[PDB]
Design a protein around this ligand. Structure first.
Ligand SMILES: [Mg+2]
Lengths: 97, 135, 237, 67, 169, 190, 254, 79
RNA sequence: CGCGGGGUUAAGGUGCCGGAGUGGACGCUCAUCAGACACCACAAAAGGCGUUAGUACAUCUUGACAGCAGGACGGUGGCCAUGGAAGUCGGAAUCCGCUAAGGACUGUGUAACAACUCACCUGCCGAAUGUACUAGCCCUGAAAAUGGAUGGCGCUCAAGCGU
RNA sequence: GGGAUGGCUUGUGGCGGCCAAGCGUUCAUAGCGACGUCGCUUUGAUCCUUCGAUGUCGGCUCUUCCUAUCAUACCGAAGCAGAAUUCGGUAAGCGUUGGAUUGUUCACCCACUAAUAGGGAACGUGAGCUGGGUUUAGACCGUCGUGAGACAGGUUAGUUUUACCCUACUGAUGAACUCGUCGCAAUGGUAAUUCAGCUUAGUACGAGAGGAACCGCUGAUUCAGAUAAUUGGUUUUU
């Protein structure tokens, strides 16, 4: 018979299976859609997570309660030494992708 | 219009249903017993709770006798559970206390004993008009 | 606004500019819409729609027949009885229902179980059909009450129809004369179909040939009270 | 043909005339022929013709057919 | 076992089981006229009688206001009173002259003020506690009616400190 | 019942050139050209006479025979569109807030764009893009009138219906709130 | 305030359709003969109780929404008597309350019978009997429901007259300028026309004098005959003159 | 309805043996019952049924009626 | 009904799974989960502006059905009633004239009128139609709860239905 | 020793009379008969009439499904002025709560809320945990019985205690293709939800009381995925 009291699901089925990642480095599943009218640019970069710290921000958010006031926010520092470009891969379109 | 105020930022709720707070005005009541919180959501087994500036429904357990038979709207002006403001300041008061109001937010009493919270003062203009000190 | 303000606005400003043509087009599509409803609705909604449309066709046909026949009391009553609502008014001493479905004792009574052990005593029987217990009734003690006639199934009145006068009156029950299935059922006063009961006919105003007032007569139950919640009877006249 | 226009039954007093009106017109014309000396033919083309009532009233000694 | 449920033809089914004469009816009417109530007498066995012919009729005021509503509806229906096909033109008034209207209006105002004062003399409140509903449950009253159906004598017990308070009318 | 032969005829004016190939009808006149693919209907086209187009169905059911009337009316509407044109006059009416209608012609697409503002005091800007070949003009003879003209009756009437349907009064009594843009006249340009 | 918050009153057939659709669609419908008899009894008892509760809440809304003429100001009481025949008003609401009580009694009787019913067929017959008797009782209310819906619409469109405030009451014969005066001093949209009895109901407008709110009441005209010959249209004006403590402006055309 | 994008549970046309046997048994029982009711039927039935006749759209109906008159006169003369 | 070889059939089948026909003739049906082993129930004299075949009655070049252009009148604002009510809030009557035809009116409308519209008639046009039933096939004619069943794929001048 | 009604059901009563299109019948004018109709079953009252457990349910945790939709989204109609609604349609995407009450069919009250919809997968018997129907042995009271004892009953206390197997599920390795790096994407899963405030605007609308919405802006509720700068908590940093 039915549940006497309704309750939503614990957890999301979108993130199944709850297994270990197949690689240590994160995979870009999708890149932004190419527009040939745009100037040439790169879509991604790498860095190393160093830690986090605290800031004070001077907020300019009209309509908000903390507008023209100071707010304390958490921020994460990513150490980013410059990358080195060493290669070029070409991709064609096929009926299999 | 229900008594839940608009333009309130998220804060740590310190007073669930069943909590007895002090009565900070001179309406005659000495304490307020929470039985409901305005604007509370629906969730299984979760007790409704409110913070400073929230409206609750409270009965009087101790005080003037003709106040003891009704359920009054009240605004929580002080809480003892520490909470954070947007300037990064964590703070708390030494007691939990509220004031009896009507659903329009106007106070039953005429004076407030002790300080009130900035959230309560900014959300209810009559409490800011009847407060002697705002912290 | 006050009083007929929508009518005043209607007079001062008119309609929307497309209202007449729009209603004309909708009334024109109404036939296709009816056919789509007839062929596309499902379930109880479709059944109710079909029944309603059948009724509409019947009254439409009646109206057309009356318009075709445009160009073409029963019993004698006195003038003081004219224009009032009068009833229509329509050896072998056989009852109108000579035979009904027989009721076995297993259907008639159910076993009431007693005791605290897993094995229960089963000597009590509960009467599962409506009964008439009579006046000045006091229930037997529970230690000596084999037959249980529950209070919620007890009846005192019946809707009795007079075949000659064509009137149905609610009358008190005087006694149960004969249950056709069992003399035990007659003794218990069970009110089932085909049962002969005695009814109080004082309200019907029956006077005998000697001038006496007949206030008790016989009726036969013509329904199933256990299924209907009411006792319906016809006077044996 | 299941798909057809629903013919409207008019719940009004006046019915269609039929052949009886034609025979009545025949009999009226054939009985008004021997009673008069002249038979004029007149035309009212692309006209409202509601003044023929006034013409009939003014020529009360004549007979007018407009069938 | 399913029995044969059959009713034989019989002349007794078509006769009058109980009859009464007019003299007997008049005697019983006089008997109820001279009836008095005695607390020290008990009823042991009722007499089967046509009580609708012996009991006196209801009061004329009761018999008139019992039928006033249907009488008004028969005199003038709902559709002729108010609606798109209403034909009502004159109202029903309790006054006939201007002086009667003035007196009726001032009496109506006085009565309205008096009723307002009576209602005035007579935050939301908390719900009544469920303990004060005790003694009114369906199980308890099933028990009471079961005992009443079972018993011939009923001892109604009253506290001597509050007899009319504890009396169950 | 299957009918052996059914025939329809379309007269063609002298200033019209009609080319039908593989049931693709191209109609040319003074006002331009119109094109319609009618390959979803089984029909035989022919020239039965100078200036008459014949339509035949052989061994067709009643439905197939009846479709020829639709084809006849569609081709006649194409002919009327390339000779006289089609014109829909719409009127916008208001009670309190004047309806602000701006008509522009987009450069890269070539279609007209109609912007509607202040409809019952709303701050949103409604924008309707016309079908190609439809010209919209704010009238100067009368007050609060748009004129949509073209060769395609389908395009002109659909653009008029789009303008009519974008300005719907919502959640208000339509007996009291009469605001909107409605088609007032339909006819030919010439 | 007014009387615009009365919920709409359906006809008898619409009432039956609404209640039976609620019973059919807000409860489960599938019961099986092979189930336990307690389960079958619970199913049909729930059907009967839900039907009665829907009827009871609709009837109680109708009863508690309409004005109580015993509790009104005498002006409002006499105005409602002129407009709607207070006798018919009270008879209609009494019929509604009597039907509500009878439906509750039928529900209690058939629930008590369903406590003792022994099979699904008998339970079904008892449930259908209860629902049919309720439908018959609703069908016997055809004319009061139509009358009460009409009265509800008229009450919703009635103007709001405060009987204990500052008020000008304009009276007289027709065609003397009463509505012209009320239009000139207030914002009320009372029509002005040259024919007699243009105004057939009480109209009210408002004005400000020395920072105070005054209400002005335009009335239908009154003719010169005794009150037994006055119709309802003139008796609205007579009621206003008789029960409203006002400043009377009697208009005359010389 | 949203049947195309979101269809519901299909209705099975696959019968079961128990349902087939029950339907056949009930059909045979109904046949026997209507045979019994036809035997005990109280309704009046004509000895000779009302014959529909000759269709109007038959082209030779009139000459057939001419014939029918000819055999009735011939039988009257012979008898 | 012994163990085998060959031949021929019954019931049932021949689009593939599967041996045998995308066999032949004439038709019918398009289903938003058709139908293919149905007969019983739902279920009724049931509802369909689906599609075809019939039966009966009726109109029709003396012009039928549909349309378009016009007429749709006079006694008369018929009687009673109503603050008002003129065909059109109601109650009851419902006739005559002119007629080619027009109701003491079918609806919209007016406070009441006015005005429009319908019934009916004439002009234009042009040849077959209207109504009600019957028989087929198709749709609806009530359904819950894991994802599934004409055995499955699938099949639409069939690989469905009748012979 | 033997055992452990079902293509059922759903929304509209029964009895009695009358009418009745039609079906029959026209050597008998009977009989069936939908649609209906008529009889029985308080002037808004009363509150001094609650009418019988043989049939037993719960609660927790948790997953999914149905739609017969309570709310949210869109649409049709209503004297629907506005506001708030009512009736109905498509729709299961997403939610559907916190408590009191056992001198009792535990069902009804209270509040919060957008709303606090109804069911199935058990109850057409049935090993998760734990309370009532419920009932071994001890004991008491009431009824019956001469008694052993039994019950119309009421009360108290009271023994079942797997998993390491197969499968399913959740995770984790992995042989064969030399090892490794960078990738593709068949298929399976899939995610967000509701309210409030500022503005529009005291504007449209309204006699008055009152009183919206689109676009734009800012927060919060429920859910989901992460994280430890800060604040709390935790201390075998012994
Ligand atoms: Mg005037």
């Amino acid at each position: 018979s039915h549940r006497k009291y309704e309750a939503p699901r614990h957890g999301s089925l979108a993130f199944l299976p709850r297994k270990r990642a197949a690689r240590h480095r994160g995979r870009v599943k999708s890149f932004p859609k190419d527009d040939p009218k745009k100037p040439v640019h790169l879509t991604a970069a790498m860095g190393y997570k160093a830690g986090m710290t605290t800031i004070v921000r001077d907020l300019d958010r009209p309509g908000a309660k903390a507008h023209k006031k100071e707010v304390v926010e958490a921020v994460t520092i990513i150490d980013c030494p410059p990358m080195v470009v060493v290669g070029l891969v070409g991709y064609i379109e096929t009926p299999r992708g | 219009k229900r008594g839940a105020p608009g333009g309130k930022l998220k804060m740590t709720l310190g007073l669930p249903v069943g909590a007895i707070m002090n009565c900070a005005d001179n309406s005659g009541a000495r304490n307020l017993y929470i039985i409901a919180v305005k604007g509370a959501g629906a969730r299984l087994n979760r007790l409704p709770a409110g913070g400073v500036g929230d409206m609750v429904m409270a009965t009087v357990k101790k005080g003037k006798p003709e106040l003891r038979k009704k359920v009054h709207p009240a605004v929580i002006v002080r809480q003892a559970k520490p909470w954070k403001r947007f300037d990064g300041v964590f703070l708390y008061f030494e007691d939990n206390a509220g004031v009896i109001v009507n659903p329009k937010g106007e106070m039953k009493g005429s004076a407030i004993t002790g300080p009130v919270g900035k959230e309560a003062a900014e959300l209810w203009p009559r409490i800011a008009s009847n407060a002697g000190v705002v912290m | 606004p006050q009083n007929e303000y929508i009518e005043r606005h209607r007079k001062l400003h008119g309609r929307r500019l497309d209202a007449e043509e729009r209603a004309r087009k909708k009334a024109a599509r109404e036939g296709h819409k009816n056919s789509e409803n007839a062929q596309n609705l499902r379930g109880l909604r479709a059944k109710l729609y079909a029944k309603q449309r059948h009724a509409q066709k019947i009254q439409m046909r009646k109206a057309i027949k009356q318009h075709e026949e445009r160009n073409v009391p029963s019993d004698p009553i006195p003038s003081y009885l004219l224009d009032r609502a009068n009833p229509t008014t329509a050896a072998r001493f056989s009852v109108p229902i000579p035979k009904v479905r027989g009721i076995s004792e297993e259907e008639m009574f159910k076993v009431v179980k007693t005791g605290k052990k897993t094995h229960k005593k089963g000597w009590k029987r509960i009467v599962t059909k409506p009964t008439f217990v009579g006046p000045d009734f006091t229930r037997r003690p529970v230690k000596y009450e084999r037959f249980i006639r529950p209070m919620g199934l007890r009846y005192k009145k019946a809707n009795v129809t007079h075949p000659t006068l064509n009137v149905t009156v609610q009358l008190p029950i005087l006694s149960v004369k004969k249950n056709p299935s069992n003399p035990l059922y007659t003794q218990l006063g069970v009110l089932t179909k085909g049962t002969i009961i005695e009814v109080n006919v004082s309200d019907l105003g029956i006077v005998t040939a000697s001038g006496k007032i007949a206030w008790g007569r016989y009726a036969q139950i013509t329904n199933n009270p256990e299924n209907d919640g009411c006792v319906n009877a016809v006077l044996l006249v | 043909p299941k798909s057809k226009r629903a013919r409207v039954y008019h719940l009004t007093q006046v019915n269609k005339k039929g052949r009886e009106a034609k025979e009545r017109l025949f009999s009226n014309i054939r009985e008004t022929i021997p009673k008069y000396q002249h038979c004029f033919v007149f035309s009212v083309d692309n006209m409202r013709n509601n003044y023929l009532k006034d013409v009939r009233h003014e020529l009360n000694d004549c007979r007018i057919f407009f069938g | 076992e399913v029995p044969k449920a059959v009713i034989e033809p019989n002349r007794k089914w078509f006769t009058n089981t109980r009859v009464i004469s007019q003299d007997t009816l008049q005697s019983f009417r006089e008997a109820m006229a001279e009836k008095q109530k005695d607390p020290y007498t008990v009823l042991l066995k009722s007499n089967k009688l046509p009580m609708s012919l012996i009991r006196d009729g209801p009061k004329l005021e009761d018999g008139l206001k019992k039928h006033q509503a249907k009488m008004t509806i028969e005199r003038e229906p709902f559709s002729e009173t108010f609606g798109p096909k209403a034909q009502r033109k004159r109202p029903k008034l309790s006054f006939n002259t201007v002086d009667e209207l003035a007196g009726y209006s001032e009496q109506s105002l006085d009565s309205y003020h008096a009723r307002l004062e009576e209602k005035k003399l007579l935050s939301v409140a908390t719900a009544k506690e469920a303990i004060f509903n005790k003694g009114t449950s369906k199980r308890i009253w099933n028990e009471l009616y079961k005992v009443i159906d079972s018993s011939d004598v009923i001892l109604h017990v009253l506290d001597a400190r509050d007899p009319l308070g504890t009396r169950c009318r | 019942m299957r009918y052996i032969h059914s025939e329809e005829t379309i007269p063609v004016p002298e200033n019209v050139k009609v080319s039908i190939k593989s049931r693709l009808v191209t109609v040319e006149g003074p006002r331009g050209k119109l094109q319609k693919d009618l390959s979803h209907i089984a029909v035989n086209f022919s020239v039965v006479k100078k200036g008459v187009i014949g339509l035949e169905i052989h061994h067709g059911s009643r439905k197939d025979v009846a479709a020829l009337r639709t084809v006849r009316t569609i081709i006649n509407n194409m002919i009327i569109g390339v000779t006289k044109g089609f014109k829909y006059k719409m009127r916008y009416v208001y009670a309190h807030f004047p309806i602000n209608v701006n008509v522009e012609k987009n450069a890269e697409t070539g279609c007209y764009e109609v912007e509607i503002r202040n409809f019952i005091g709303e701050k949103i800007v409604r924008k309707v893009v016309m079908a190609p070949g439809v010209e919209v003009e704010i009238s100067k003879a009368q007050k609060d009138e748009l004129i949509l003209s073209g060769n395609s009756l389908e395009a002109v009437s659909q653009s008029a219906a789009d303008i009519q349907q974008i300005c719907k009064v919502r959640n208000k009594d339509i007996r009291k709130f009469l605001d909107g843009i409605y088609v007032s006249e339909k006819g030919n340009i010439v | 305030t007014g009387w615009k918050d009365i919920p709409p009153v359906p006809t008898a057939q619409e009432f039956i359709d609404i209640v039976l659709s609620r019973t059919q669609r807000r409860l489960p419908t599938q019961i099986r003969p092979g189930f336990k008899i307690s389960r079958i009894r619970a199913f049909y008892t729930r059907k009967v109780k839900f039907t009665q509760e829907t009827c009871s809440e609709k009837f109680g809304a109708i009863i508690s929404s309409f004005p109580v003429l015993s509790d009104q100001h005498p002006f409002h009481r006499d105005l409602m008597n002129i407009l709607y025949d207070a006798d018919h008003f009270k008879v209609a609401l009494g019929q509604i309350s009597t039907a509500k009580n009878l439906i509750e009694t039928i529900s209690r009787d058939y629930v008590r019978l369903l406590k003792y019913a022994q099979s699904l067929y008998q339970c079904k017959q008892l449930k259908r009997a209860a629902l049919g008797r309720m439908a018959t009782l609703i069908k016997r209310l055809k004319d009061p429901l139509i009358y009460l819906d009409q009265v509800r619409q008229h009450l919703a469109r009635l103007p709001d007259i405060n009987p204990t405030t500052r008020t000008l009451l304009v009276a007289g014969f027709p065609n003397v300028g009463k509505s012209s005066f009320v239009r000139s001093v207030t914002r009320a949209d009372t029509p002005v026309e040259p024919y007699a009895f243009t105004t057939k109901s009480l109209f009210v407008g408002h004005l400000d004098y020395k920072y105070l709110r005054y209400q002005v009441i335009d009335t239908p005209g009154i003719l010169d005959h005794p009150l037994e010959e006055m119709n309802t249209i003139e008796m609205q004006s007579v009621t206003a003159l008789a029960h409203l403590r006002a400043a009377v402006l009697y208009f005359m055309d010389i | 309805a949203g049947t195309i994008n979101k269809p519901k549970k299909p209705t099975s046309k696959r019968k079961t043996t128990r349902l087939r046997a029950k339907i056949s048994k009930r059909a045979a029982e109904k046949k026997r019952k209507e045979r019994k009711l036809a035997r005990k039927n109280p309704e009046w039935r004509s000895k000779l049924k009302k014959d529909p006749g000759i269709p109007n759209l038959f082209p030779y109906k009139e000459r057939l009626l001419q014939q029918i008159e000819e055999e009735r006169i011939r039988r009257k003369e012979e008898l």
